[PDB]
Each structure stands twice: as structure tokens, then as C-alpha cells.
Amino acid sequence: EGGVLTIARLSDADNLDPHFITNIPSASVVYHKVYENLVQRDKNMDFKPMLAKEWKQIDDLNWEFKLQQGVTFQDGAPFNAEAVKKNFERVLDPKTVYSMIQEIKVIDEYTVQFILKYPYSPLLSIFASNEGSILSPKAIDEKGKGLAQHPVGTGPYTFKSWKPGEEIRLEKNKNYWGEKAKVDEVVFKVVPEDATRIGMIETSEAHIAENLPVTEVERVKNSPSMELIENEGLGVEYIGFNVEKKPFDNPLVRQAIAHAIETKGILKGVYNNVGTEINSVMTPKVFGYTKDVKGYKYDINTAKKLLADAGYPNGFKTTIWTNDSKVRMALVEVIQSQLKGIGVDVEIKVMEYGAFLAATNKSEHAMFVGGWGNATGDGDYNQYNLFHSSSHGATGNQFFYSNPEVDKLIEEARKEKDETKRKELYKQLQEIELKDALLVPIRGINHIAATTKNIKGFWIDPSGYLRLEGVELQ
Amino acid sequence: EGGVLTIARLSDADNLDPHFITNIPSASVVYHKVYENLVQRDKNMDFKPMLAKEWKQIDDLNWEFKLQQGVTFQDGAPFNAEAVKKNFERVLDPKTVYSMIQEIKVIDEYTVQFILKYPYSPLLSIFASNEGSILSPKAIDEKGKGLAQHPVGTGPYTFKSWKPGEEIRLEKNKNYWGEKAKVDEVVFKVVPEDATRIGMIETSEAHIAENLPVTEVERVKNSPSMELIENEGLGVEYIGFNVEKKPFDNPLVRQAIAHAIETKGILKGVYNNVGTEINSVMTPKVFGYTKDVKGYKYDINTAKKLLADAGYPNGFKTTIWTNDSKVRMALVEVIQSQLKGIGVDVEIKVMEYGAFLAATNKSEHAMFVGGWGNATGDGDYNQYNLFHSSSHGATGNQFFYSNPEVDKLIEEARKEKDETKRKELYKQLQEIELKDALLVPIRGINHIAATTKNIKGFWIDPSGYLRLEGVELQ
Structure with missing residues (x-):
């Protein structure tokens, strides 16, 4: 020992303040090391106690947490309800990621209540993320070194x-x-x-x-x-379609391209098997994931027949947009090769990340290489940012998809208290999105x-x- | 049919004249298609009849060929001894790759003799290569289209x-x-x-x-x-040492580095298993190859101990030189990583092919990435160019190796008539070169x-x- x-x-890290950390190298330095959270996820992704011993959702808008006793910050400040309130007030606005909180109530020394402005069932996933790290109230109040360069937790x-x-x-x-x-x-x-x-x-x-x-x-x-x-990541990598860019407004064309892509060859030949084979927009570690989703079997004969049915018996010319990366270049070349096999001439459009986000935000792209971190481990963060109509562009919905039924199921799932009903709603959403062939999953991003x-x-x-x-x- | x-x-091809072709894309267009040879190699790499029905080596300097009868060139010119003589006169000088021929004798219409200035046992391997392609005597003599853009053979x-x-x-x-x-x-x-x-x-x-x-x-x-x-190539890819660049003049240092390199990981991770695992400077398809050669087992413990013995208990700093290629960049990075594991800090020196050849020719390099096509399929072309002392620099001996015993065995093997004795001489040569750890074989280059x-x-x-x-x- x-x-x-x-x-x-x-x-290096660029900042050690968890309320402003925007990247993995910075968060890994303090997460569960200098700082801790009210709750944490176990091996099965179930919420388990940490700085909160117990918790309950009262009605829809009231979340109560019973806190661990006998806990001290590294500067000697006691950990209690007042410390939790002061920490989350730093990320509060009563009309950020905590824009849902109206008020924080200190019931007693070890009992704290979060009062929401609107219902938000994925609340625990936010408290378990790096943004839920609890800062010392002494580091917030007392005169001294900035939080960005000197973190202080429990x-x-x-x-x-x-x-x-x-x-x-x-x-x-x-x-x-x-x-x-x-x-x-x-x-x-x-x-x-x-x-x-x-x-x-x-x-x-x-x-x-x-x-x-x-x-x-x-x-x-x-x-x-x-x-x-090698661990099982939350991240998803896929080939997406701008559903408003012709001819990808035709679901038969999207389905034809999905049947033309073979992902085992990419996972092995390009990524050396670093990653998980997946058929959904979510990885198995994201709440709401389903192993019963429509996958388009690799079948060049079906792909060619669907393209002919769509009105393209001689194929067509299109583009695939990606940020510049050595591994992403090898990926789009395999896609370009597989699509040539069904008569689709794909021109590769590659540029640096900033220009790529600006172009996808202006709906300039047809096909694109997408990625979503699914950081919170909850279906809401995956679904709202990628498929809700209000997220069009660089926010995540680079598909420019707007289906009122999907918008409603997303808003419903975010507000549903029963986890079994939430799961059913995310399974339905994945069914609609994969049946609509909005994307072709390449891999679950694994960390090595x-x-x-x-x-x-x-x-x-x-x-x-x-x-x-x-x-x-x- | x-x-x-x-x-x-x-x-494209850049030239279709086999006496001036310098590359694979050009040679593949005419080899055994427009043109043919006196002899050819079978599946077991044995010389078999083609335009010559039979052949014999008379004494040391006299090679006689009995020619196929009933053969015509595509322009109607008959194939006979005069056609063979005229073809090889085009690449003759009686005091090129045929600098060994003194005279060509036409014995009769279908019998031709090659009289050598000096002994050269690998003669058939030259006749079986693209340079041995037989041109129409009419295309050589009669007024018309150049051979470079209009090939004419049998x-x-x-x-x-x-x-x-x-x-x-x-x-x-x-x-x-x-x-x-x-x-x-x-x-x-x-x-x-x-x-x-x-x-x-x-x-x-x-x-x-x-x-x-x-x-x-x-x-x-x-x-x-x-x-x-995927076919079994002649080509060899390796990490070579400039044996006159300190500390690589110390055989213990070369041996330590050989024990530090693991090639299965490179073959799989970098080349996606395109190639053959080998432990010699020759591939199994090169005449003289031996499967009984000293290989340095991947053993980091032995590598570290040998470096300490050599006088480098804390390692040393050196360079690895290579031409610029995406796959060669991934290769040198794996080598750099494996050598760091034994305390050897390797700086990568990468430049375009011309500059790389000029630098290796001036003995500027320490370690280098080497490759040898072994085009003729005979040990002489491998051994003379890579290890003989007169080949120092861009000729092939980038090791700057000069061992009089190796020079003698090479000159002896080139002049030996008994194939069994030739094989023994090339086995001895491979033993000396691998025991001296002049290089670390990476792979036999396979064509896909x-x-x-x-x-x-x-x-x-x-x-x-x-x-x-x-x-x-x-």
C-alpha cells in the first residue's frame, strides 16, 4: 500500500474547474479523485450511493437527497446540505446544464432538496457526470487560489x-x-x-x-x-444522412446505402477491432438501449434493387463530409469503395473540425461522418441532441430530421417517472430512427x-x- | 471462351520496351502476354521450357539452347536462333544486365549458344525475367513504330x-x-x-x-x-543497420535491438496481415533460401541485458531513416515504441525517396527501413547488391558491410555450377548475416x-x- x-x-488538462471542464483529459484528472458526486453508476450502469446515502423523487419536480455523514473536504470544510446547495448555486439560474433547477432547499444538515422548474427524469445522470462534482464551500467563499488551477473536494x-x-x-x-x-x-x-x-x-x-x-x-x-x-464506451460513430439533401429525402435511397455498407471490415481493417459492433444509435451502456432494432443486412443485391426502385438504376453522384483525421480518412475511403459497388459515386469532402461543424450547421452536406459521446449514459442526451427538430445543425441533429412523433416521444421520455416506460419510449425512438435509416452505425467507441x-x-x-x-x- | x-x-505503363522497363506496372502489361522468354519458372520456382525446348551448360562459359519449332512473332516473322541472337545483341557489349555475354553463336536454325566473358550461374534467372523478353527481329530492323509504344512478340x-x-x-x-x-x-x-x-x-x-x-x-x-x-512475393522488408554508424558497429547492440523487435504485431497491426513472416534476408521463393537461420527471439529482458553488456545500461539516442509513406510511418512508430521499451530513444528521419537514397549513399543513417525486390528469384541478386563490399550505398549495401569472407562466398556462389553447392553457399551467407544481426526482417512482401x-x-x-x-x- x-x-x-x-x-x-x-x-495536459486545460482547466480543473468541473463546472467549466469541456474535455476528457481534464475531467479524468479530478473525477472520483479530487472530487466526488452525490451518486455514481455501478458496473450494470445502476445509480448507487456516493456523497448521497439515499435519494427519492417526490411528486415530479422535487428530488430529495440524504447525505453521507462524517465527510470532510480536503481543506477541512465539513460536507453537508449547505455545501451541496452552495456548489449547485454556482451553476443555477431561477428563470447551463442545471437550467432546470428553480430552487435548492436545505431541509436539515444532511438533507437537501432540488426543486425543478420543469420535469427532468435524467437528473441523476447529470449529478453522476463530472459537472456534478461537489466543490469545497471554503474554496468558493474564502480568499485564495482559483478553482481552475487548485481543485478541492472530498x-x-x-x-x-x-x-x-x-x-x-x-x-x-x-x-x-x-x-x-x-x-x-x-x-x-x-x-x-x-x-x-x-x-x-x-x-x-x-x-x-x-x-x-x-x-x-x-x-x-x-x-x-x-x-x-479496452473498455466499453458510450460514444457512437456512424455514417449519417442529411435527410433534406436530395436524393437522401427518399427513404429507399437511405435504405439502399445502409444495405451497401459492411462494418466488420471497417472495424477490423481500419480500427484493428478497437470498438464494438452495434446496430443502434446508442451503445449497450446508454440507458434506453435495445438489442431488438432494425438493422440493414449487408446485401449489395438488395442495395442495387432499392436504388433502381428509388429511380436510380445507374446510381448517382454525392458527397461524404468528415473532419480531417488519418483514421477517418481510411473510414470514408472504405465507405466510398462500398458505395461505388452499387453505382454511387462518392466525393470525399474533408476539412478541419471548425469548418466541418460550420458546413454541417448550414446544411451543406449530404452524407457525413458523425460521432456522439452520449456522456451522461442516458437516452435523453443521445435523443434530444441528435434527433429532436430544435437541435438542427452543429447542436447534433446534422440529419436535419424533424418528425413530430419523434419530438413528442423525446419530450415524453424526458418527463416520464417510470424507468420501464422510459425504456419503452427510447426503444420506440430507436425503431423509428433505424427504420427511417437516418444513419448507419459504424461502431461503439471503445477507450484503449x-x-x-x-x-x-x-x-x-x-x-x-x-x-x-x-x-x-x- | x-x-x-x-x-x-x-x-499506366510508361514504356513497353522490355530492355528499358524499370517498373512492375509496365512489365505486367507485356510479360508472358505480348512477349515470351527462353525459359520460365514453375510453381516450385524450377526452370521449365518456354521458347527454348531444352538447354545445357557446356563447360562454365557456354550455354546452349534448343528452340521451339513452329513459332511465329505477331508480325509474321519466324522465331528462330537468328531472332534470339538479334534480340540479345540489342543488350550486348563484348568488352547492362547482359554485360557477361562475349558472343552469341547461331549453331543452326533452332540452336543458339551464349558465350560468357566470365562465369555467371544465375544466367537462367535473367532469361526468365522481363528483360529476357524476345522482340521481333522485324520490329528491330524494318521501318516502323517504336518498340516503346508498340511491342511485338510471340x-x-x-x-x-x-x-x-x-x-x-x-x-x-x-x-x-x-x-x-x-x-x-x-x-x-x-x-x-x-x-x-x-x-x-x-x-x-x-x-x-x-x-x-x-x-x-x-x-x-x-x-x-x-x-x-494474395501471392507469395520475392520482396523483403527489414530494419537494417549502418554497421559503421556508432554504436551499431558493436554486434551486441545490433543483437539487443533485434531481440527488442516483435514482427507479428507489425504484420497484423500495420499491414493487416498482408505479407509473410520471415527470419531471413530472402523469401522462401528465392533460390538459396534456408528455414534454418538464427532468429533473435523477441525478448525484452535479453535485449536490456545485451545493451547493458554492450556498455549502454541506460540506453542511447539514435535515428531511424525511411522514405515518406503512410504505412512506413506506422511501421517506424511501432519500432520507435518497441526500442523505447529497452531505453533506446529513436528519432524518426523521414524524407522523400530521392533524398533518402542520397542520404543512405553518404552513410548519414544509423537504422533504416530497407526493401529489396529480389526480382530474379536468385540468391545472387539478393546477396551481391545487399551484402557485397563493392555495393556500399544506394546500390543496396546500405549496411556499409564489408566482410571479406562474405565477398568470397558471394563471388564463389555466382560461379558455382552445382545447384546443391550453390544452395549451401547461400545458406552459409544467410547464417553469417543473421548471426551478425545486420538486419531485422519485418516481412516477405506479398502482392494483393x-x-x-x-x-x-x-x-x-x-x-x-x-x-x-x-x-x-x-
């Missing part, structure tokens, strides 16, 4: 130092309320060369190497000094890392966050 | 037309002396987009698609309309193509040439 755990990664690791562009160090919180850390220090070391991060595991300069390129996967698996860590064989208990959660709970250095 | 066979490929296909940058068409030679072609026409169509060439097999616009990128391999294997063709399932008898020979003998369109 000790030692310095070194994590070699591509980049977690098993205390912030020790930050050498920007070089390393972040955390040290074991010896006053942690739960199971204390089994390492003395954690170092997030910035090592931009991918080859060097992995090699450092074999020299014992690092224990974990993040951000592995797919071309290094076999080099990791065949090394006797390390293990490949390499670790020394001398590590026990390390994993990456479905959000892509490094998880150090129960980690031991052997 | 008929139809138009379409071959979609990356580039082959089963006659040259029909050339639309430069677009297509070359050959038609069935209805007067062919052997088994007549089972297709009417062959079209070598220039289609530069890789994705489009492969897709054309599914639309029936092409029957064969050449020059496949490794990222399309699985897309080919999973298509129901096509088959992946996609074909319609409606094709029978197509293959690519070990040289990378398309082979149409016995091809049928179903």
Missing part, C-alpha cells in the same frame, strides 16, 4: 501541484472518508509522442499509457510487460490504454474517464 | 492500342503457338482512386483491381462479389489484388507480375 503511480498521456486524492504542460500531481488524501487510496501519489505526466508513452511502460517510467493509436494495439497485446485495457502487468484494479469507465478506485501497485 | 477482360490499376496477346494515361488494350493472338487465350481482349484501365478500382468489381466495370491499400483488405474479403488474391468471383486461373507471380495464362471468364 504505497508508491507513485505514473500516468503518461498525450496532453475525494481520495488531494491536489498537490501543477507544472503546466508537464505534469499534474495528486497525493493520497489520508483523511478520505471511504476506502483510502493504496498509492501515495498519482502523476499525470504529459508525453506527446505516442510511441514513447507506450515504451515507458516497459522501462517502468510509467504504469499507464493513455491515448493509444490503433496501429499500436498489437504491439501492446504482444508485449510481455503490459496489458491492453496500456498498463504495466504490475497494476491491479485499473479501468476506464464508459465516459472515457480513468478510474483509480481500488487500484493497487504490485 | 471469349469476352473483354478489364484490369483496373493505379497507373505471346498469346497481340498489342492493339494505347491511349496514354487511360488504357492499354491487347487482343487475343489467334495465331499463338501454345494454348490460345480464352478471352478476346485484355484492357489495362488507368483508375487512380483506390476505392473506385475495387468498387468497379461489384458493378462489373472491372474484373481485376490491382494496387490495393492494406486498409481495403477486409472490405475485399467480406464482399460476396469478389475474392482477395481483388478479382470478380467470375474469374478462374488468375494469379500474381512472386515478382508482382499479373499472370493471365489459363485465365477464363465464367
